[PDB]
């Protein structure tokens, strides 16, 4: 049987913006968490409605894995329950969320001394996030009273910024990559259990 | 008639280095999670490391890199090595039996505890 | 980090009475809790885990009821040996787990 692609996750060249976050499937395989359990000691490991230990003997039907980079002190709002521009206008977590995250930092490969400008955020928006949904849309945001009617100026504002990453800022400045691993479970065949 | 006997602690000077144990006895230790879970009479009950059934380790923030546990299936005994010893260490050391029904976790048995100092 | 709060502090009772102690979390995390009994000087010892589910061989007198950040542990009729300190756990987010402060029963 076909062992979980969990090294294509991890070992990725590029990964996406906050705000565009990437989503991959993992069905119809047998899942050696060991990947997890040889971790290099930098990485950053939670887990929430499931022991890690334990993850060796429980079925799950789908597994999903989202992947983006976020700044350094942003880290802490991946997480049930969490307040922040990032949990509100980027990324959110349910309350019952039942599953793992892993992060770590990724200076020697997402910075440049230039700035690294292919790294943005949403900085305007009306409402919070729903739980796992996503905003890719970039249209003038009215903090005014006139409409905009799609241009720039007073009280017209471009919704997204831009991380800027440098290699001299400090840790908390930093880009960081974040996997999301989120266990689902309905009645169903059961395709992801592996020993 | 599941029992867990620890042994090692003691007098210390801060900065040391100590390896305490805990023999098992009435349940088959390969087939069980294992913790280490110290009480003081300040903050009370916190837990200290955790070791599975395929040699995956666990440390809070605060004990990450100086402690590290380890198993000795064949001989039934489970070991703590602690180095770079501090003043907020001293405690009651249990080693704790863990387990789960379902998703939910807890810890069934605990041992009997043995008094760590460090001066 | 999660924060666990226990009430009451202290909780003076006589034999036979009905006692009740509660746990509150700073954030919801539905049915976690493991409810812990310690006598002075022995090892800690589990009641209930699930917050509702007996632990297999224990004085039925105990009981737990609750969830999301609100939990209850209760004694039907308190004896002379169900004097200790009682702890509540919290099992949601790991491998970081967190213990209450702890509610000490004395027996008036």
């Known amino acids: 049987t076909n062992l979980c692609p969990f090294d294509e996750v991890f070992n990725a060249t590029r990964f996406a913006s906050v705000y565009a976050w990437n989503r991959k499937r993992i069905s119809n395989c047998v899942a050696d968490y060991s990947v997890l359990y040889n971790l290099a000691p930098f990485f950053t490991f939670k887990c929430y409605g499931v022991s890690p230990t334990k993850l060796n003997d429980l079925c799950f039907t789908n597994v999903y894995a989202d992947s983006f980079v976020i700044r350094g002190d942003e880290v802490r709002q991946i997480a049930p329950g969490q307040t922040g521009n990032i949990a509100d206008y980027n990324y959110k977590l349910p309350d019952d969320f039942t599953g793992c995250v892993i992060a770590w930092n990724s200076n020697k490969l997402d910075s440049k001394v230039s700035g690294n400008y292919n790294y943005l955020y949403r900085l305007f928006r009306k409402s919070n996030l729903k739980p796992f949904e996503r905003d890719i849309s970039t249209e003038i945001y009215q903090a005014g009273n006139k409409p905009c009617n799609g241009v720039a100026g007073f009280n017209c504002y471009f919704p997204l910024r831009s991380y800027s990453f440098r290699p001299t800022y400090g840790v908390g400045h930093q880009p960081y990559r974040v996997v999301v691993l989120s266990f689902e479970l309905l009645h169903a065949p059961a395709t992801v259990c592996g020993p | 008639e599941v029992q867990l006997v620890e042994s090692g602690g003691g007098l210390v000077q801060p900065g040391g280095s100590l390896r305490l144990s805990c023999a098992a006895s009435g349940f088959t230790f390969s087939s069980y999670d294992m913790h280490w879970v110290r009480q003081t009479t300040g903050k009370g009950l916190e837990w200290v490391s955790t070791?599975?059934?395929?040699?995956?380790?666990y440390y809070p923030d605060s004990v990450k890199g100086r402690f590290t546990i380890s198993r000795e299936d064949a001989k039934n005994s489970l070991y703590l090595q602690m180095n770079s010893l501090r003043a907020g260490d001293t405690a009651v050391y249990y080693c704790?039996?863990?387990?789960?029904?379902?998703?939910?976790?807890?810890?069934?048995?605990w041992g009997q505890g043995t008094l760590l100092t460090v001066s | 980090d999660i924060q666990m709060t226990q009430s009451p502090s202290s909780l003076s009772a006589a034999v036979g009475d009905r006692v009740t102690i509660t746990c509150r979390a700073s954030?919801?995390?539905?049915?976690?809790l493991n409810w812990y009994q310690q006598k002075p000087g022995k090892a800690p010892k589990l009641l209930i885990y699930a917050a509702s589910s007996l632990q297999s061989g224990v004085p039925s007198r105990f009981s737990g009821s609750g969830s999301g950040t609100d939990f209850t542990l209760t004694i039907s009729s308190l004896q002379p040996e169900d004097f200790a300190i009682y702890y509540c756990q919290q099992s949601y987010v790991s491998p970081t787990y967190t213990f209450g402060p702890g509610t000490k029963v004395d027996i008036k």
């Open positions: 954030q919801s995390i539905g049915s976690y």
């Open positions: 704790a039996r863990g387990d789960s029904s379902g998703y939910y976790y807890y810890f069934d048995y």
């Open positions: 070791i599975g059934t395929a040699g995956d380790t």
